[PDB]
Each structure stands twice: as C-alpha cells, then as structure tokens.
Design a binder for these strands. Structure first.
Ligand SMILES: Nc1ncnc2c1ncn2[C@@H]1O[C@H](COP(=O)(O)OP(=O)(O)OP(O)(O)=S)[C@@H](O)[C@H]1O
Ligand SMILES: Nc1ncnc2c1ncn2[C@@H]1O[C@H](COP(=O)(O)OP(=O)(O)OP(O)(O)=S)[C@@H](O)[C@H]1O
Ligand SMILES: [Mg+2]
Ligand SMILES: [Mg+2]
Lengths: 333, 131, 333
DNA sequence: TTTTTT
C-alpha cells in the first residue's frame, strides 16, 4: 500500500532530478562505475603495498610532504614516469622554480611529452591546474611546493606585509573548485608541500604543512616522506634511505609505511625493494648476511643481491610476480 | 606591559569553555613586569587542584590570575594551558613521562590528567598575579 | 461571561485559520502527533546514550564536524547502514567527490540501494536534497562536507576571485527552504562539515565550521567528532579511538560525550561499546585488566573481552538488552 | 563571511 506509493514517488523524484541536472546526476551507488577507485603505480612497490589499493588513486587529490631533500620531487617524478609509461599525459606545475629537466629525464620521465608550467602566482598555478583538469586530456598533475603558491596580492606587496590566511583561503577555494573537476575527468592532482614549525604539539612531531587546513580534508592520500639514512658505495654517498608514511588514506587502511632507496640519477631502487620484499615473503632466503633464492645463493649484502637481480631479468620477473600476487590486496587485472 | 583578562580556566578537570575571545574582547586589563608576547592574556583560576602544599612553590590557588603566552614553547615540568577537543581547557603542569603526555596537579588530592591526540597546549603560564 | 466569549472568538479564529491553510495548520501542541520526536540509531550505542533520545531525530537537520580523518564519513555510513537495516531509503550527496563504494559496503551499507549523487555545484546539491525531501520517499540524506558546497558563481569564477558570504547566503537560503520540507516528510538531513581556523582568537575555541551561521541555528543536533588515539594489534594500527561530543541538542541535554572505536574495514566497534557500557553498568566485572561476566572470566583486556562477547551471541544479546533498558534515558517506543 | 603563520 504505502510502500508502492513510496516506490512510485522515489521513481518520480529521481526522474525529475535526472531531467533537471542530467542523466548521471543521481543513481544507486552499486551501479555507479564512475565511483570505482582506479590507482596508478607510485614507482615504489613497497609504497604501492603500503597504500593498500596498489598506488595513488585517479581522480583524487594527493598530498606528499616532508623535510628538505627527503625525496618529494623524486617520488613525484617517478609517479609521473610510471604514469607516462602507460600512455598517460602528465603535467608538472613547478611553483618552486627548481625543476631540473635533465634529472627528470634521468629518472625516466619523457621530457618532450611532459607539460611544465612555472607560474608567477599561486592563483595562476591553481587556475592552470583547473584548466588542465577540466580539459580531461591530462591524467596526472603535480604542483611542486604548495608552500611556493604565492597569492597575487602577496606578490604585488612588499616583503614584510602581513597577508593573514590569504594562501589558506586561496587553497580552500582551489580545493572547492578542483575536487569535482578532478573526479569528473579522472585526473590525479598531487600537491607537494613543505614542512613548517608549529606550537603546542602534544603528540607527534612539532611540524605543520603550508597552505592551511583544507588540503588535509580534501586529500584522499597524504604521504609523509623522510630521509632515514644514506646509501654508500664504499665511501661515496650514492643514494638515500627513505621512509614514506601514509598518514591519511581514503581508499585503504592508513598508517602503513614503506622503506626504499632513492639512488641519485636513477630514482627509486625497484630492485632493492624486490630484494627486501622477497626476503620478507620468504621468497628470498636470508642466511645472516647471505641472500639465496630457491637454494641458489644469490649474493651477500643487499647491494650485491640487487646487482644479481639486475643481472638476471627472469628471476626478477618471477619474484616480482609472486610478490605482487601475494601482497597487493586490490588487483585490477 | 598590560594584557587582556579572558575568562577562567579550570585547574584540574578539563572543563568546557563556552565563548570565544578576541583581542577586542574583555573589559579587564592587568599589568605586570613580565614581558610576554602580544598574544599573551590573563586567565583566572577557579579550582584548588593546582594549589601546592604549603612550603613548596610555585602555587596557584583559586582566584589568582595566571599569564598565558601562546608564543612560548612548553617543555616538560612547565606550567601550561591545555586544550582538549577544541573546546575544553585546563591549567596544569606538563610532564612527558615515559613517552606519553600527562598533566599533573600540584594538589595530590586530584588525579593526573591523561592526554590524547585531541589535546594541545594553548600556551605557557609565565606569571601569577592576585586580582 | 467573559471567558465564554473568548472561547467563541478563539474557536472562530481557529476555524478560519484551518479553512484558509488546511487541517493541520494550527492545533494544540499536546494533540499534535506530527511534532513527536522520532530517532534512529547512529550505529554507536554510546552515541545513542549521549544523544539522550536514543539517536538522531527524524525530520531534523544534523551537523557532524571535526578535524581530518576524525570519522565523519564512517559515522555517517554507519547511520545509513543502521537505517537501511530498518528498510529505510537513504541518499548520499558526495560533494567532496571522495566516497569509496567498496568501503561503504564494508561498513554494512546496502550499496545497491544507496542513492548517490556527486553534484557539480552547491546549489545543485541543495536542490537535489530539497527534491529528495519533498519526495517523501527518502528517509536519510547526507551531504558530505558542506565545505565542498561550491556556489555556481564561484565555480564559474576564477581562483582568487572573491565571493563574500556567497556560500553562507546559499546555505542560509537552503536552511530556510529545507527545514519545513524535512519536517513535513520526516527526512533526516545530516550535514558533514570540515573545520577551519579563526584568525585572531586569543582564547577559547579557535575553530569554526564552513558555510556560515545558518547551519548552527537550524541544526537540531551538532556532533563534534575527534580521533583521540589508535587501536593497535601489537604493531599494526587497526583502528582509531573516537570521541563524539554533542555540542548542540534540541531533543535532549547537550554536552554529553561518546567514546567508541572505529575499526578500518568494519566501522564502529559495537561490541566494544557493549563491553564498556556493561562494565560501567555493573554488569561486567573488571579486576585490573581482567574482564569477567557473572564470575566467568571472559578475557584479559578490552580486545579479548570483545572477542569473547562476539563468540557468545546469547550473552551479548542479554547484556545489550540490559544496557539498553538501564542506560537509555529515553527508550524509544 | 573567510582563513593561518613562523
Ligand atoms: N639532479 C640531481 N642529481 C642527483 N641527485 C639529485 C638531483 N636532484 C636531487 N637529487 C637528490 O635526490 C634526493 C631527493 O631530491 P628531491 O626529490 O629534490 O627532494 P625534495 O623532497 O624535492 O627536497 P627539496 O625540493 O629540495 S626541499 C636528494 O638526496 C637530492 O640530493
Ligand atoms: N577505504 C578505507 N579503508 C580503510 N580505512 C579507511 C577507508 N576510508 C577511510 N578509512 C579510515 O577510517 C577512518 C575514518 O575515516 P573517515 O570516515 O573518512 O573520516 P573523515 O572525517 O571522512 O575524513 P575525511 O573525509 O578524509 S576529512 C580513518 O582512520 C580513515 O583512514
Ligand atoms: Mg623538490
Ligand atoms: Mg570523509
């Protein structure tokens, strides 16, 4: 009786809403394929495992922050290169004006197909990001150094003028205007942030990000990257040991962390990640300081085992396939 | 130097504070020799939980004004104003015992206040004046 | 003499008003069954206790706000799942464009029946909510992050353009147009809000919510939800310790607090809430770290007690009925 | 109405 009337009224109101706003304006979440979460590789297998879904989600906002030389730009460029290897077009908004195209080419980024912008003001940078997202022809956008997103009024004024909450207001408005566009065009916007000092922190580090509080609410994934050591080939420092913490995750469980090596000129050491992950998944036998695979001793020390894995592509593919099958909780294909 | 007087702070309960204070608020201004920042303000204590036993100083009985400077970092062993959940405030001394933050009172009769992640330090208590 | 004339005049005026406006236009407050307060479970028993009347009221406006990853969406989806278990029809207005359908399914939400809309503009969102309320066939509507309710003018504008109070005026008009419709159709509209910083607040609450002042007045219940700790299974963080403070209540006493755990992939830990409420209500004995029910030692620590109460459905239901009888100030008919 | 910053 009343249930049939309710179903009729629901159908009529739904049809009215589709007529007023569009075919996809409202529908059941079960049949909504635009709400499916799709992810792309971050260039680090340990990070893809720590992210739960297998990478950074498409159509969302991602924040990567950390101290100086912690690896933010390198990790972001590895994400860009991995996306470009899958035929995607990417853009890099270099607000800090400190992007080296030769290093990006060294990390594997196709420099010729990478859209780069060095904006004068933060409003211009966010307008360029909005235009690229609305176009739908750009899959990954990176805004280097959110802290460098300077308001036009701040640029026009002299040093010493107080612009109270101007950047925070601008970033809040940008988040408002960009969340829907990014979701509509399935464009991944990665904001790189710097770390700033903070008063009264009872728990955790006495640190804060720049640009205000809106990016905390709007980011689907927030990554805390830090340099936890050095990689040495004898006496030369050839890389850095980096830890990435997933302080926020909207597509999987948060607070997982990843450890990998950023080797200068090469980027994230994928093969070192393979060594460590095969060791942890009992695929590679760890006998003190000696590493072995299926009985065959592959070498001693992490560096020599990584060199061996470079030397033998087939066992590398086998270990990678087994680790990806065993550890990735959301396989797509 | 003279600073605004803003409401009261419960010493040992984390009592809610309904009302928001700007520099233009408050009709009470109290002067002292302490050279604090321009964000410093006075808080008057209702509660005897931070009254130290006689013979040990410092002590903060009910009714005395405490100067709070949010621009001075609070280290363990210092007296501070703590905010819980964005709305609740307390006046206790801060110690970071065993890696977990605690607010302990100067009165043994009152318990130590555990701090969660929703707790932050409003400022450092740097002066004391009777009204 | 004088009183009879007054009664006659009042009866004539009442009849005139009913003729002009309708049968239910005016009547005594005591014989108005439409004005009775009807509540639904929030998915958290401690929150049902804190709200006084046993849950969020039907036909009202509810605001939930807090910091990032405080559990606003999870609490909302638990409310939606609890309502859907009772056969109600729910709608999710995802203005943030950050809803995971799979995680919503994991929280118990009937995804195939959850109406989902990702509006382009804030006016479109509020008009969809108004149409759903006027339909009378949707029981619960949630607007995720009214901070993302961007006015059409602001969306069509540029980054950095000033739209003073435009979202606030739009939300004010939405409240004015929606309060009566929600009351008439008995639809619960839940607004999720993000937290911004007040500049210049020397003491007191340093935070506001987005959207202006109208939501504060029109909300019957306002919930301040915060993450107060972590739930760890030794090393992995498996959940969060959550506090909810009822900062506004038009149907019971405000400023009551609710504590519960949000487990990732499960939602609100109902069994842990049952354990704590039984311990408080002298039904479960706690000797240091030992939990015991009627002499039988059920486990050591909160997690073991929760697991034991999960493994014994009969005693769980018994404790749940006892707690619901005892603690509920306003047990629903 | 809007929003931190060192
Ligand atoms: N052109 C380069 N050649 C070799 N090593 C480099 C080069 N550029 C950066 N590195 C190193 O790569 C590591 C990470 O560099 P980045 O990705 O620039 O770090 P970052 O997080 O961007 O820090 P910033 O931007 O300088 S504050 C550091 O150890 C750098 O020394
Ligand atoms: N898909 C998911 N899988 C596992 N955990 C999740 C997932 N989505 C959210 N969580 C976690 O669940 C907790 C509550 O998350 P939410 O309900 O989204 O809170 P929230 O207030 O909506 O935060 P926002 O919307 O990002 S500001 C957090 O600890 C999240 O990290
Ligand atoms: Mg950089
Ligand atoms: Mg959410």
């Amino acid at each position: 009786a009343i249930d049939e009337n309710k179903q009729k009224a629901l159908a009529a109101a739904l049809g009215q809403i589709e007529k007023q706003f569009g075919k996809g304006s409202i529908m059941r979440l079960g049949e909504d394929r635009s709400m499916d979460v799709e992810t792309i590789s971050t260039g680090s297998l340990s990070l893809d495992i720590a992210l739960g879904a297998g990478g950074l989600p498409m159509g969302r906002i991602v924040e990567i922050y950390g101290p100086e030389s912690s690896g933010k730009t390198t990790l972001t460029l590895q994400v860009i290169a991995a996306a470009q290897r899958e035929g995607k077009t990417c853009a890099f908004i270099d607000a800090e004006h400190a992007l080296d195209p030769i290093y990006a080419r060294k990390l594997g980024v196709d420099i010729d197909n990478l859209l780069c912008s060095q904006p004068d003001t933060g409003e211009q940078a966010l307008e360029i990001c909005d235009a690229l997202a609305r176009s739908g022809a750009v899959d990954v956008i990176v805004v280097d150094s959110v802290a460098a997103l300077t308001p036009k009024a701040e640029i026009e004024g002299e040093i010493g003028d107080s612009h109270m909450g101007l950047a925070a207001r601008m970033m809040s408005q940008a988040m408002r205007k960009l969340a829907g566009n990014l979701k509509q065009s399935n464009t991944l916007l990665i904001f790189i942030n710097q770390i700033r000092m903070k008063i009264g922190v009872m728990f955790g580090n006495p640190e804060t990000t720049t640009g205000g509080n809106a990016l905390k609410f709007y980011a689907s994934v927030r990554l805390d990257i830090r340099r936890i050591g050095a990689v040495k080939e004898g006496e030369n420092v050839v890389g850095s040991e980096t830890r990435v913490k997933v302080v926020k995750n909207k597509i999987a469980a948060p607070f997982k962390q990843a450890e990998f090596q950023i080797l200068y000129g090469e980027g994230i050491n994928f093969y070192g990640e393979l060594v460590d992950l095969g060791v942890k998944e009992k695929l590679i036998e760890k006998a003190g300081a000696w590493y072995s695979y299926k009985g065959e001793k592959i070498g001693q020390g992490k560096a020599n085992a990584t060199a061996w894995l470079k030397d033998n592509p087939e066992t590398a593919k086998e270990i990678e396939k087994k680790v990806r099958e065993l550890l990735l909780s959301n396989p797509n294909s | 130097y003279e600073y605004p007087v803003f409401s009261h702070v419960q010493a040992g309960m984390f009592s809610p504070e309904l009302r928001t204070f700007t520099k233009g608020d408050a009709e009470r201004w109290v002067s002292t020799t302490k050279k604090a920042s321009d964000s410093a303000f006075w808080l008057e204590v209702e509660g005897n939980s931070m009254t130290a036993p006689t013979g040990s100083k410092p002590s903060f009985p009910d009714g005395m004004l405490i100067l709070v400077d949010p621009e001075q970092a609070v280290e363990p062993g210092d007296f501070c104003i703590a905010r819980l959940g964005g709305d609740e405030f307390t006046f206790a001394k801060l110690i970071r015992d065993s890696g977990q933050v605690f607010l302990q009172p100067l009165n043994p009769q009152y318990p130590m206040i555990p701090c969660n992640e929703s707790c932050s330090v409003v400022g450092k208590v740097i002066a004391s004046q009777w009204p």
